[PDB]
Every structure is written in structure tokens, then in C-alpha cells.
Design a protein around this nucleic acid. Sequence first.
RNA 1: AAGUUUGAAAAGCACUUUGGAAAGAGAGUGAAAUAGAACCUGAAGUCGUGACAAAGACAAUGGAAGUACCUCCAUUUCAAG
RNA 2: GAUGUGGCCUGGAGGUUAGGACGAAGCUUAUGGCGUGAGCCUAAGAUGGACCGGCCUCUAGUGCAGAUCUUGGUUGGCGUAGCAAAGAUCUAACGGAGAUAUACUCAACAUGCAACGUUGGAUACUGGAGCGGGGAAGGAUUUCGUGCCAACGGCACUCGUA
RNA 3: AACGUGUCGCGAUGGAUGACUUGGCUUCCUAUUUCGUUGAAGAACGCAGUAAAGUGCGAUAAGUGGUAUCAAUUGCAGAUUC
Lengths: 53, 80, 118, 153, 50
Amino acid sequence: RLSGMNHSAHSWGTGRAVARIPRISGGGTSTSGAGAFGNMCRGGRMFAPTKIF
Amino acid sequence: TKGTTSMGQRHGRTHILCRRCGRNSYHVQWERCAACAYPRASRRRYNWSVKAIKRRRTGTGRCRYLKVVNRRIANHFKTP
Amino acid sequence: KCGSRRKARRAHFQAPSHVRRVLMSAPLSKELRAKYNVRAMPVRKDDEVIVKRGTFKGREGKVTACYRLKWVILIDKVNREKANGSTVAVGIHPSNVEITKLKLTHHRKSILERKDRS
Amino acid sequence: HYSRKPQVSSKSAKAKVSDLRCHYKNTFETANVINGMPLRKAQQLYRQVLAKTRCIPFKRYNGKIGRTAQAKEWGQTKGRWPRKSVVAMMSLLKNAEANAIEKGLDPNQMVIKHVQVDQAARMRRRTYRAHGRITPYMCSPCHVQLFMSEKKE
Amino acid sequence: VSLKLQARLASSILGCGRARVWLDPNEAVEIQNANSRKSVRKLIKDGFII
RNA sequence: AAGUUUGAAAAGCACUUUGGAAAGAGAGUGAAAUAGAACCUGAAGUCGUGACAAAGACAAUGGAAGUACCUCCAUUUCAAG
RNA sequence: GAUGUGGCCUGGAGGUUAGGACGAAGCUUAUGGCGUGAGCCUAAGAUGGACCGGCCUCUAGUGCAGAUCUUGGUUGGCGUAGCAAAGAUCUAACGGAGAUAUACUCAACAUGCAACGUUGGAUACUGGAGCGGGGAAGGAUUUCGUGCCAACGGCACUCGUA
RNA sequence: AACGUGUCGCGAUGGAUGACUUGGCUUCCUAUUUCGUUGAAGAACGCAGUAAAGUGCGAUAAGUGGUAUCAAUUGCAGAUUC
Ligand SMILES: [K+]
Ligand SMILES: [Mg+2]
Ligand SMILES: [Mg+2]
Ligand SMILES: [Mg+2]
Ligand SMILES: [Mg+2]
Ligand SMILES: [Mg+2]
Ligand SMILES: [Mg+2]
Ligand SMILES: [Mg+2]
Ligand SMILES: [Mg+2]
Ligand SMILES: [Mg+2]
Ligand SMILES: [Mg+2]
Ligand SMILES: [Mg+2]
Ligand SMILES: [Mg+2]
Ligand SMILES: [Mg+2]
Ligand SMILES: [Mg+2]
Ligand SMILES: [Mg+2]
Ligand SMILES: [Mg+2]
Ligand SMILES: [Mg+2]
Ligand code: NA
Ligand SMILES: [Zn+2]
């Protein structure tokens, strides 16, 4: 249930020349500022995740 | 000016190394740790950061006595 | 042993030294088989073997080492040369050889006695 | 393994150099001009370029370089004098000459027949720009291969 | 060759700036051989450094 | 971020020759070196080189119908047919 | 916008029927053939080195050109814009692979340039609120000697806080 | 002419695809199964003939003692029931 969502990611908003997808916080690594949480982002959460019910 | 120039005005340090937990989080002026709350007897723990809890909990270190006592329990305190 | 390929391969490749010893066994010859009623024995230093598969088949020699970290045995007559000219021994997997003469000790005799099929 | 093969292997000499730290665009022009030349003629040309009495014509990578009279002999108006590439190509020619001598051929009869320059893998540095920006500063090295053959009078 | 070490040691021994230390340009081989304050003092006594 | 996935086995390139060195040219191991050490396969995009086709400015690409030259492609025919 | 299709394609399961070291998957194409089409099949590889095709049912994380889409890699502009505050170096000898480096012909110029460390000499600058000599905060071996010059010192190095 | 354009053969740069898998995720079960003032969990500093990290260990320190095994360890050295 937690896979692909273990980040404190927030959208940067409009007014910067980037797409409005949520982005990883922080700095000092190659993952900082990368896209997050979406089913189209590398390292994101899949669409309609599967369940045991 | 509030940017580059002011970066050169930062002189001392707010935090030093903590005796109990080893992080650079011991507030010098209020003699207490921001990471583990030393010298309060119990430690800091909050459910709004399960990630921090899992970074600090049992089994992330050595367990140098717990391994021994676990084996004794599994063997029923066998003795000659 | 395991209805799980993942677990079986993990156990094989992480086996300790005393388990690798048993896993590195070789069949006995027909004469030794008939003398002892035992099919196979773990290989040991100073036994005599003959190579049965590969490039060196038909060669004979004496076991100089059971490396056991590389999963091979070294035979003194099985070797080749480097570019320099000096010779090096070539490792062989123990299931590709046959034992023709055992190195006997009291405990090895006891092992054969407990594995006897009579 | 070169991208072309000499007609007669026994009368040919080869030479090659990889990841050479000279500019790919300068070395391309410097090497391409000697392609059909006899070996002694090529070496004379390189010496005269070092002396600045003749030039290297820049035919492909020449956007907004200067104009010179010494380019007229090549049918152009643009040319330069790149010493760093010239000395490396002189070294390569010396190696090919040594290989020919060891095979037992006469260097005063060799004719260069194959020349090829390629972009190699790049190296990365950085430069600092206004408003706290960082931007790439890269190096562009090259591979060079050539072979020469004995002409038959 | 480099006589930086000898020049530094001679500055220290003679108590002057480097601009006042003079190393003989014809005895470079001899000055090359001095590696200690004792040897440099011997050079000063012999007159290859003034 | 990052599979250390060379090869069955290091047998991981002795030796000669050019070079300050890195390397190159030979020689050798291996079934294979276009398997030579971050080494299975090795795509697209982009670039070099050799050969060839032409070609004004008509942006290029595109449709239809022919022709000149080419074609490591297919199929059918060779005598009573 | 609705619906149909013994309509096409992808990963896995139950059946059935086959292939492969005399070369499976993957990849390449002025390789043709079939189909209105989605696509299918053969040929060649001077490619690869161990798995896999058809048919009937079952099942799904099942088809991309564009979302200022995500991540990796390329690319024209381009040898372009530029590398212009803090005045500045010159000369000989020594050192170094870093030269005085040549095919005929040719005494030398017109065919090996550019650049470096050390010592001596010359010329200038800092100008005691100093590119002088010591300390606190901050840093933690950057200090010393001998080597070395792959990367780094946005030019260079035989030199370096590398 | 040159620069440019197009096609085919051969090379470079680049690291996709296929095959591989001692990893992950999910479900189910069995127990004389639940730490600490007799000093825990965590944190620090050390220990090898050669040893940066990691692993193991504590000045008895890549281990002492006992039982069972039965001839290694291995990059290089060093040295049968011991
Ligand atoms: K410029
Ligand atoms: Mg995921
Ligand atoms: Mg203040
Ligand atoms: Mg304060
Ligand atoms: Mg301009
Ligand atoms: Mg800048
Ligand atoms: Mg800034
Ligand atoms: Mg490969
Ligand atoms: Mg989907
Ligand atoms: Mg796509
Ligand atoms: Mg300028
Ligand atoms: Mg200035
Ligand atoms: Mg003044
Ligand atoms: Mg530089
Ligand atoms: Mg893959
Ligand atoms: Mg409890
Ligand atoms: Mg260590
Ligand atoms: Mg004690
Ligand atoms: Na699936
Ligand atoms: Zn603390």
C-alpha cells in the first residue's frame, strides 16, 4: 500500500517553465526536483494498485 | 544586502555533537538535543514521522546482548 | 530437496565448508565399488583419479588440492603453460572424475564401514 | 580493424591513435588535407604550417573564422594554423613510417591512401554563470586512423 | 635543478630576506648537495652563499 | 545513482620493433579478442569515410502517371515446346 | 456517438501439436510473397549463442506522436559569445622527451613552432590602515621531505593547498 | 568548382532490447517464542603477519572453552582427532 508514495513531494506551481507534477524536495542528490507520485513518473505509484480483496 | 553578502556574516554555531545520539543536534544555548531530547530521560518519538522511527528503532544497530539472550531463550536456558 | 528453485540455489551457493565437502564427491571405480559396496566418496587430497569428461579425459594423476572456494580439485598431471612459460594447474569439477585409489586412514575406514551396503 | 582494407597488405603500413586530447574539429581539418599525398610531401607541408608560410584549409567546421591569402592555393578563403593538432599528426606519421621500415618498405615511395577522424567520448568540467547558474564546459577529443601504400612506378 | 630548499635554509640561517641571499651561479652542483642546516652553514663558511 | 552478465577455464596478450609515456605495428592464448577487463547481446538518434546519383535560384516533404539507369529479389520459359 | 467482426497484436495459465548446437530469443534490410487494413510469412546476415512457434480454451499492470508529460542519452546554434578591474616584464646560463626534429636539390633566411622550472643580472610594483609578522571564530593535515604529472589548478607547467 | 543534398558498403559515439536472477512483493503454518539496575536498545572508540569500507569480535578483541566432524584456509605469506 505504500509503494511509490514514500516521499514528501509537492508541486512547484505555475510561473516556472516546468510541468505541474509534484516534485521531490531537498538537494544534494540526483533525485532532487524529479517528478513524483504519478503513474507516468519514474519511481511513482502505479495506476489502480492491486488489492487482496 | 540579504543574500550573498549576508552569507558572510554568519559566524558561530547553534548546534554541536550530542553525547547520547551522536548527531550534530545539541543546542549549545538551551542545553538539549533537537534529535533525541537529551538530557530528558526518554527519547523523542512522533507518529507523524514513521520514517524517522524506522531509522532509529531496535535492530538498526548491533544488538550485542539481545542476540545472546535470544539464543538462551530458544535453547530453554540449557545448562550442564 | 526444495520445491523452490530460489531457495535450493541459494543454499547450494552459500553452503559452508563442511557441506561443500560432501557436495564435491566422485564415483568410485568398478573394482573399488565391488570391494567396498559403496558408490561414491568425497574427494580428498592424495587420492588417485582419472578424468572422464572434458578436454583432459583419459588423464590420470594425484589430487593435490580441493580448493572448495572455487568448487574444483587440482590434479598434478593436469596443467598447461602461461605466456611466460611457467605452468599452472587447471581446475576440474569433481563429478567429472573417477576415484581409482583411496587414501586410507582409520577414520576414512570407519566412514566406509558406516556407508557399507552389505 | 580499419574501416577500409589496403589492396596489397604486404606493401602497406598502418597507424592509429585513440582518445587523443586534441580538438576534434581542428584535427579533422588538419588530417583530411594530406589524404592523397606522398609521405614526404605531407611532412613538408606540416613543417611549413608550423613555420606559418602555408596554412590548413578549413572546409567544414569554419563558421565565422578569419580570411587569409594563404588559403588561395586550396581554392578557399578561410584557413588557420593549428599547432596542437599539427604536432600530433606529425607523431602519427612517424609511427607509420617506422612500421613501414620494419616491414621492409621504402618510405620515399609511400602514398597515403586512407585517413579517418572520429569523435571520441567526452569529458566534463563546469563553468559558473550569473544568478547562481552552473553550465557545462566540455572537452571534445578524437580517434585517428590511417594507412599508406607503396606506389608502383 | 631547484635550489629552493637551500635558499630557504640560508634565509633562515642568515636572518635576512630572500632578496639579500646570493647563491653562486657556478657552484650549483655543490649547493645541490647540502640538505641540512649544518651543510648549508658549511657552504656559507666556504663562500658559495653570501 | 549503481546487475561486477570477459571466458568452460586467466589460458588476463611472453617476445620483437617505434615512442618520454600513453599507445601503435607484429607475434601469441582461446571455439571466438568485432569476448582484451566494468569486457554477453549491442537497437534507435547523431557523426566519419569510400563508391555512386545527380542537381540552379523553384524551402523540403507529398499524390498520380510514365521514362532513363540499376537490382545480393521473385516467378516463368527454352524446340516442338 | 452507438454497435459488429471463425478481425489484428502483447505478458502469463489449462490442453494439444511441433521445432532447436546441421544454431532458439533478440537485432539488421533496394529480402520478396500474402492481406482493403491492423499485420503475417519466407530469404540473406561475411549477426547472435540457448531456448521456443501454431491451434482451442482461460486470464491481465495488454497496443502511443504530442499531456509547458517522467527518466536517460543526443543535437543545430559553434570552434561562435567570450576568457578586457587589481600597471610588467626583459636577458643569459643551467635543467628537461618537451630540439637546432628535412625526401631529391640544397652554406646559412625563405621547411619544428609555441611554451616551462632554477640561479645570476636588469627593470618595476606593494608603500607600515602592506600580495609584512602573530592570534580568536571557522577549517582539520591543507604543514615537512622525496617522487610523480592520468584526472584537477576554466591558457600552460619539468610546478602545486592535486 | 567549392559548400550542401540523396542512396548503398564499412567504421565511431550511445547503451535500448533479448536471454539470465543468491532480490522484492503477496498468502499460509509450527512453537517448554517476548529486552532492561545481574546495567537494555542506541551511540562512540578499538582489534588481522599483510586490512580503507563492510562483516565478526572487545585489551582473552576477524576470537578463548565444550560437543560433533574429519583434512584444510587460500590474494600472498606462515604453520592426523592436536
Ligand atoms: K572570439
Ligand atoms: Mg516502484
Ligand atoms: Mg550578526
Ligand atoms: Mg544563540
Ligand atoms: Mg565576432
Ligand atoms: Mg561566470
Ligand atoms: Mg552564488
Ligand atoms: Mg559487447
Ligand atoms: Mg497500462
Ligand atoms: Mg515511444
Ligand atoms: Mg583578451
Ligand atoms: Mg589587466
Ligand atoms: Mg610605489
Ligand atoms: Mg587548464
Ligand atoms: Mg535489459
Ligand atoms: Mg511487550
Ligand atoms: Mg578496517
Ligand atoms: Mg582483562
Ligand atoms: Na503482467
Ligand atoms: Zn541527541
